[PDB]
Amino acid sequence: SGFRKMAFPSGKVEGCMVQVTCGTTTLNGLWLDDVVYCPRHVICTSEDMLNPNYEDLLIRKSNHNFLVQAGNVQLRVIGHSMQNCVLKLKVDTANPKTPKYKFVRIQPGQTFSVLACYNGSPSGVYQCAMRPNFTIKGSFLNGSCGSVGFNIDYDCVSFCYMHHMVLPTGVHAGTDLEGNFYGPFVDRQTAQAAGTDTTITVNVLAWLYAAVINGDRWFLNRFTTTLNDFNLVAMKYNYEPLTQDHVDILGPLSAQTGIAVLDMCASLKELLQNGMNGRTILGSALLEDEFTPFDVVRQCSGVTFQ
Amino acid sequence: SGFRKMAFPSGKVEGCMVQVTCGTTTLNGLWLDDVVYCPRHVICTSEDMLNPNYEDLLIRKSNHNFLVQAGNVQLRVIGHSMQNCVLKLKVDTANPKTPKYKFVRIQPGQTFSVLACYNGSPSGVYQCAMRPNFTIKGSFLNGSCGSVGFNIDYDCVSFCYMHHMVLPTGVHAGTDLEGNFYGPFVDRQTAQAAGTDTTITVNVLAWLYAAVINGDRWFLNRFTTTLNDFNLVAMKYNYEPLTQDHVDILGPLSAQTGIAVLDMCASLKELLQNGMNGRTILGSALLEDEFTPFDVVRQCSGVTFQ
Ligand SMILES: *[C@@](O)(c1nc2c(F)cccc2s1)[C@H](C[C@@H]1CCNC1=O)NC(=O)[C@@H]1[C@@H]2[C@H](CN1C(=O)[C@@H](NC(=O)C(F)(F)F)C(C)(C)C)C2(C)C
Ligand SMILES: *[C@@](O)(c1nc2c(F)cccc2s1)[C@H](C[C@@H]1CCNC1=O)NC(=O)[C@@H]1[C@@H]2[C@H](CN1C(=O)[C@@H](NC(=O)C(F)(F)F)C(C)(C)C)C2(C)C
């Protein structure tokens, strides 16, 4: 029983984490085959950061300027280049622990696991969601830069995120592993705020299905509603529109519980309108939106990896 | 920036997980050197579990009935003995990936990471607490038995929990790695109940301190209180009493915030009596008691491992 925010096992990724130093700046890098990936601002000092000229700072630099350490092993850089906001360092050793991997760009609402790192060493793991405003609600200190987010499919590690920065609200921003930002953010120290964040309705519904599977059923009402009427209400409350795709993704959970997605949609309509009256669902007193429908299925089926 | 329930990186433990089969009952095993630890009810069929005589059941068993899989590769069991409610299967191959490890019995209120496994394969990692009544609020499906809970100190893995059973409430119960239950439970299928569960006061205070460090300060008072006044409130709400040891344990957080423990107790007093009034704290609408003071120090100072 029970229902937790669960991260993927981190071992496959742990074996890929290294430390990259340029001058007096050190941050985390990701070592796959004979390439190390890190944030490009590794070449910046804390005063370059108001508005760097990366092309210019970079051209100055030579292979020998970049120190790569993997545990105790010093890695010899034999090449460097900049793709968007990431630096790729070609090294003389392929990482023997390199797992099957791919790089993906996740969409708003999708979850993944973060392995928070300081000085190339793993400190912690937790699950997050890409928020609709393209930020994440992570946990990161100074030196976290270059920590990575990922999903695991059996044996294939899909890397979706590398960490770059924290925004005034205390939420976070970063890139894909091709160094393109999620959202309209830039890698410089200047005024930038995320837009308004919305709640991810498809995930809330998934969460409500989890509750039902775990015996928490008090919020089921005898109404139903249409998708159009549902969405009119959800716009009112800063909830994301629900699509037909969302509906069909909820199917497994719908078929499991005997509860039509439009029925659950109606339970949710009432909760937004009248609130939760101090009552909890699965121990939470707020509606949770950082579990996808696949997340609920895996934790309510036993999906494993190796 | 940010406060999340963070788990320890799981790689060291992942390499120790095997699959243990006896009859057609399969569950999780922990392979350290040339010993594999699992729950002793691996030797039980369905009929046995209402009231097994483990001694008698085990006598009918022999090494030959014990099939240990380690990924794709079968392991030869050359020995066996029952230690309390756990089974020690001597195998022929020491585990090459054995980390430095110790076995510890944790106390109520202490947190640890769980690597949830099915069929000997990692599924997920998450953080929880030993509750005052010696249950945990985990996430476990059929086949989760023998999954383990752990802490990492630098390079040392301290194994503190092995999972055995779910209780009426949907809370879980298990043993240490020498097979002695946390709490009054037994490994048999009969109606058992945990005690009343209290809130871990020292952890709530640690979380409030995390709240202040992350800039969420609205619940601060200027009032104070003694330990005695506070305690005589606390027990009204089923908060565990707060001892001087707890005060001294909270002293790092106090010194970092500049807020005396007894002041913070005063803040918690008002919160217990006045409720939150629809206010959140670190984005929660309830008081969180599953972060120790050390946890708070770790994630607000960024301690690493491996
Ligand atoms: C990160 O780890 C990095 N730290 C350094 C560094 F010290 C020197 C050179 C390069 C880098 S990358 C760090 C992670 C931060 C620390 C606090 N919590 C985090 O998540 N990222 C940054 O310091 C980041 C880099 C410059 C300024 N950064 C910021 O996060 C700033 N925010 C903004 O400018 C805002 F996004 F607009 F709000 C800051 C310092 C928090 C105000 C750059 C963006 C390249
Ligand atoms: C666990 O994984 C094990 N499963 C088996 C099995 F199928 C055959 C033999 C041995 C074991 S151990 C499982 C974990 C449970 C399943 C559901 N959620 C979990 O956490 N543990 C049990 O099934 C466990 C074993 C017998 C009965 N168990 C219970 O958890 C039962 N509870 C109680 O008896 C009660 F707590 F008192 F209510 C049950 C089946 C959920 C009612 C034993 C303790 C030996």
Residue numbers in the entry:
A (entry chain B), B (entry chain A): 1 to 306
Authors' text:
The present X-ray crystallographic and virologic study demonstrates how SARS-CoV-2's main protease (Mpro) inhibitor resistant variants emerge when SARS-CoV-2 is propagated in VeroE6TMPRSS2 cells under inhibitors’ selection pressure. Each inhibitor blocks the entry of the premature viral polyproteins into the active site cavity, thus presumably blocking the enzymatic processing and maturation of the viral polyproteins.
We found that E166V substitution acquired in Mpro (MproE166V) disrupts the presumed Mpro-protomer-dimerization-initiating Ser1’-Glu166 interactions, loosens nirmatrelvir’s binding to Mpro’s active site, and compromises nirmatrelvir’s anti-SARS-CoV-2 activity. However, TKB245, a fluorinated-benzothiazole-containing Mpro inhibitor, stays bound to MproE166V’s active site and exerts substantial activity against MproE166V-carrying SARS-CoV-2, while that activity is less than that against the wild-type virus. To further examine whether the E166V substitution in the enzyme Mpro was responsible for the apparent resistance acquired against NIR and TKB245, we obtained two recombinant enzymes, MproWT and MproE166V. Table S2, while the kcat/Km ratio of MproWT was 286.55, that of MproE166V turned out to be 2.397, indicating that the enzymatic activity altered by the E166V substitution was associated with the viral decreased susceptibility changes seen in the cell-based assay. However, when we attempted to crystalize MproE166V with nirmatrelvir under the same conditions used for MproWT, nirmatrelvir was not seen to complex with MproE166V. Instead, the structural changes that occurred with E166V substitution showed that the interactions between Ser1’ and Val166, and between Ser1’ and Phe140 were lost (6.7 and 7.1 Å or 4.9 and 6.0 Å, respectively). It is noteworthy that the tight interactions between the γ-lactam moiety of TKB245 and Glu166 and His163 were seen in the complex of MproWT and TKB245 and that even with the substituted Val166, the γ-lactam interaction with His163 remained unchanged.
